[PDB]
Structure formats: structure tokens, C-alpha cells
């Protein structure tokens, strides 16, 4: 509420927003300040026309401060009172065509939405207290381990998937350096060892999947198009993985092939995380040579000589050894402007290593490949 009131009061004057003045002009803007990176909204956002502004504002900040705002969405979004019952919906693509999401479809068109990344599903963060399962660590004399709790169906503490999402971006930084390592099984999001749950009702300790909802395969995809990040689980394995990491930005379609591909990469969160890391390089490092005498040909040197160590075409064995290189190739055409003598205007353009995303396949018995066995001449 203390932020609801903030953005809703300063939506049309964000620079005066109190929060904006504790992330942008405070640590990112100022000299000795240490900038932020990838905010984490611990809240759950519905389809309300109020919570929609909350994202519109936070994204207004993130967009400028360059800090992808990750959050989670409540089960109230899909208009269902139990998140597990989202599996019943055939295709969410046809869902958003419903006029109930009109306000939402407008927000997906905003530029700021290319920094929001909403997650679906909630991981179980605490196992309830049983004596034979997860016994309370009693004291050295005060017998307490014999202590039960009271739960059954589905109502014993949850936490938003957004945590593991960000907690992988951190991982995808200490190990690698950029944010390619947050998708897929073999590459990024795997999230090993989750807090499952087991219980003996009448059978023999029937395990309970750690995740809120057991997304199927086409759910993984049919969500990526809505602009959501599904936290899908492997049945029984007590694990997860992020297949999709898309922002809430609309994907569009377009006729021209190039244009169609543009919108596919921009919606992709993992890149805007990386492109953001260049902004944290420019407005951070080049500040040192603010007074030094430099040229159009000198700024194109300093800025390029850096990023050059992160661009390749050759592929390295294993994913990690290659995710060191996020980008494929980059252009950097800076140029002085008339009037202002000491001022310039850059314009870079980065093509990130396009990730795998799926494929069709038609098998067939040709019997025409080897005609030596089926041909007439014999």
C-alpha cells in the first residue's frame, strides 16, 4: 500500500516518486553510489486495475534504473480460486482474448513491460511439523520432538517462484558473468533439492509435490506467450526448471521476418538483463573520462574494446563454458552532434546468442533414399 499510493500519486511524475529516489537518483545516478540490479517483488499481482499501475510504476523505474523487476502473479489472475485448477484451461492464448483482460493487454504493449517478469507457481518453503517427519528440534532436556501440526489438502505456507528465479540470476553471475544461464535444464534454471512434503493419512507416506501446480508441456509454452514465467516441476523428482523466461511484453507477429524476430528477442527477459548490464557499464565507467579529451573514434574504442571480450561466433563445449559469451556481434556507431561541442550520441545494437525454443519433426519411411534396393533396375 505504501507503494500503491506512491506510484498512483506520481505515475505522471515518476522522477518525484519516493521509491524512484531510492534506486535511481540515490545509488545508480550518484557518483560513489553502488547501483542496483534486478529488483525482486515479493508480492502477488492480480488482474486488478490498481495492481496494474503498481507494475506500470515499478517498471517505469526499472526501465530507467536498468533493473528488471521480477515478481509473481496470484491465482486470481486466471479467474480461479485454486491455482492447481489452471491445468484445466486449454490455452491461455485464447483466454486473454476475453474482454476481462482488456486493461492487461494494454499494459503488455507498454515499453516498461519489457522489464517486468512475472512468475507462476509457488514452491513449498516449509514442511509442516510431524514427529516422524520434520521433527521440531527440541532442547537438551525439554522433550518437544513429539509435536504435531494440523493440515491436510492445500493450505500450509507457500512462497513465490520469483525467488528461485532471482536466486538463479545470482547463480548465473558468480559462475558465469551474464544471464544466459537461467533457462532450460542443461543450461540455467534447474533448482535442485526443493522442500517437498510427505504424509501418512491411511496409505504409506504419500509424497506431496513441492510445487503448487504440475504444469504439463504445452503449459510451459502456452504461458510464455501470455508473458508469464512458469515454474514447472518434474513429477516425483522433487525438482523444477525455468523453460521460459519471458517478460510481459507483447510478442506481436508481423509479416516481415526480421520485424517478427525482433519482437521475439525483446520479449525475452534474459537478454534485457544482459543489455541492461551494458548500461551499468556506460553510466558507471565512462564517468571517469568525463573531462578527458576524447573523440568519436576514441569512445568507439573504449566502449568496444570492452564488450569485444564477450562476443563470439564459435561454440564452446558444455553450456557454461559458452554462456561466458552472451552476445553474438555488436555495432557501436557514436557520432558528435552539432551545437553542443563536448556532447555525443551513441547507438549500439546487440544480437544475443539466440536460445533454443522448440522444434517440429516429420518422420517418414521414404524408400526413395536408397533406390538400389527398391528401384526397377536390378
Amino acid at each position: 500500500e505504501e507503494l500503491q499510493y506512491d506510484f498512483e500519486r506520481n505515475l505522471y511524475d515518476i522522477s518525484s516518486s519516493d521509491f524512484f529516489k531510492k534506486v535511481y537518483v540515490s545509488e545508480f545516478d550518484q557518483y560513489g553510489g553502488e547501483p542496483y540490479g534486478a529488483i525482486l517483488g515479493l508480492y502477488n499481482f492480480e488482474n486488478t486495475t490498481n495492481d496494474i499501475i503498481w507494475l506500470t510504476g515499478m517498471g517505469m523505474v526499472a526501465k530507467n534504473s536498468h533493473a528488471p523487476f521480477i515478481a509473481s502473479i496470484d491465482k486470481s489472475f486466471f479467474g480461479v480460486k485454486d491455482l492447481s485448477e489452471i491445468t484445466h484451461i486449454k490455452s491461455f492464448e485464447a483466454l486473454l482474448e476475453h474482454p476481462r483482460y482488456k486493461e492487461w493487454n494494454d499494459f503488455r504493449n507498454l515499453d516498461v513491460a519489457a522489464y517486468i517478469g512475472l512468475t507462476v507457481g509457488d514452491f513449498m518453503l516449509r514442511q509442516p511439523y510431524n514427529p516422524e517427519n520434520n521433527p521440531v528440534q527440541y532442547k537438551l532436556m525439554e522433550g518437544f520432538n513429539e509435536f504435531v501440526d494440523y493440515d491436510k489438502n492445500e493450505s500450509y505456507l507457500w512462497g513465490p517462484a520469483s525467488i528461485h528465479l532471482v536466486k538463479n540470476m545470482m547463480r548465473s553471475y558468480d559462475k558465469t558473468r551474464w544471464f544466459q544461464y537461467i533457462r532450460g535444464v542443461e543450461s540455467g534454471g534447474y533448482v535442485k533439492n526443493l522442500v517437498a512434503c510427505v504424509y501418512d493419512n491411511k496409505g504409506i507416506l504419500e509424497t506431496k509435490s513441492p510445487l503448487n501446480v504440475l504444469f504439463a508441456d504445452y503449459m510451459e509454452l502456452s504461458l510464455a506467450n501470455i508473458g508469464l514465467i512458469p515454474f514447472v516441476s518434474e513429477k516425483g523428482t522433487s525438482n523444477a526448471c525455468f523453460f521460459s523466461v519471458n517478460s510481459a511484453k507483447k510478442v506481436e507477429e508481423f509479416v516481415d521476418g526480421f520485424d517478427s524476430a525482433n519482437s521475439r528477442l525483446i520479449a525475452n527477459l534474459s537478454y534485457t538483463m544482459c543489455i541492461s548490464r551494458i548500461s551499468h557499464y556506460i553510466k558507471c565507467v565512462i564517468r571517469d573520462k568525463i573531462g578527458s579529451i576524447v573523440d568519436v573514434e576514441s569512445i568507439q574504442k573504449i566502449l568496444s574494446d570492452w564488450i569485444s571480450e564477450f562476443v563470439t561466433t564459435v561454440y564452446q563445449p558444455t553450456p557454461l563454458e559458452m554462456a561466458r559469451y552472451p552476445f553474438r556481434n555488436v555495432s557501436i556507431e557514436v557520432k558528435t552532434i552539432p551545437g553542443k561541442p563536448g556532447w555525443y550520441s551513441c547507438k549500439i545494437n546487440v544480437i544475443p546468442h539466440i536460445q533454443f525454443e522448440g522444434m517440429n519433426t516429420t518422420m517418414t519411411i521414404d524408400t526413395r533414399l536408397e533406390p538400389e534396393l527398391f528401384g526397377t533396375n536390378n
Binding site: 519516493d18 515479493l42 508480492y43 511439523y129 521440531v136 528440534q137 532442547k139 532436556m141 532471482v166
Partner: protein
């Protein structure tokens, strides 16, 4: 001295001055998180939003918590001690293990009364006395 020593016939000086541009230490990839933690019960939470110093968690979530005065005086059903008045859970959170159904019985004064007996009452040596053997 700016006056400068009188020059001899063989003045050797040895230059020890070095110019160059200083270095810059790397930037730790900061991660901001924003959520209702204190529910309006902390030193930095009770203050106006115009002045809320962000934390750091240099140590850990155990000590950055204790740094904030997170207490609560919520009522609860009573099943211990005498006299009326519902049980009033009142203690400040130190570590994250405070929500553990155990550290609670150690903190809440009333419950501790029953736990105090389990140290003395249950420690009755009816196995040392019963085991007489002549």
C-alpha cells in the same frame, strides 16, 4: 622547502614521483528485494518512506533481522497458568529459527512454565530408585 637547496656542482636528486590513473574495484551485483517484512514493526519501517535506509545483509538474514526491532503483541488462546486474560505472545525476533515451534516455548513466558516442569518432573529417577538390588 620551496626555497630550494643551493646547487652544487654535481646535484643528483632521484625522482620518486609516479603519475597514472587510479584503479576501480568491481561492483558487486546488488539485488534489491521489496516486500512487507515487518508488517509495520521495525525501526526503519516505522519511519516515513522519504527516509528508509536500505539494509544490506552483510552478515546474514539472522543478524540483519535482529538489527530490526521486529516484535509483536498479538493475542492468543490461553491454556497455561492461572487467572483470566488470553495469552499475550510478546517477544522480539532474533534469528529466523524463531518461528520454530520450540524457540517459541522458550520465549513466551507462560508456556515456559510447563517446559520448566518437564525438566524437573520428567527427570524423576524412578529407574535409579526402582532399581534397588539389595
Amino acid at each position: 622547502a620551496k626555497n630550494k637547496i643551493p646547487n652544487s656542482r654535481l646535484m643528483i636528486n632521484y625522482e620518486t614521483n609516479v603519475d597514472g590513473v587510479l584503479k576501480k574495484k568491481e561492483l558487486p551485483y546488488r539485488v534489491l528485494v521489496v516486500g512487507d517484512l515487518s508488517k509495520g514493526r521495525s525501526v526503519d519501517a516505522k519511519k516515513e518512506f522519504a527516509d528508509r535506509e536500505v539494509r544490506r545483509v552483510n552478515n546474514g538474514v539472522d543478524r540483519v533481522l535482529e538489527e530490526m526491532n521486529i516484535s509483536f503483541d498479538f493475542e492468543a488462546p490461553n491454556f497455561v497458568s492461572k487467572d483470566p486474560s488470553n495469552l499475550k505472545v510478546n517477544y522480539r525476533i532474533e534469528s529466523v529459527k524463531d518461528f520454530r515451534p520450540d524457540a517459541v516455548a522458550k520465549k513466551v513466558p507462560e508456556i515456559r512454565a510447563l517446559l520448566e516442569m518437564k525438566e524437573i518432573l520428567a527427570s524423576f529417577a524412578k529407574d535409579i530408585e526402582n532399581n534397588r538390588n539389595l
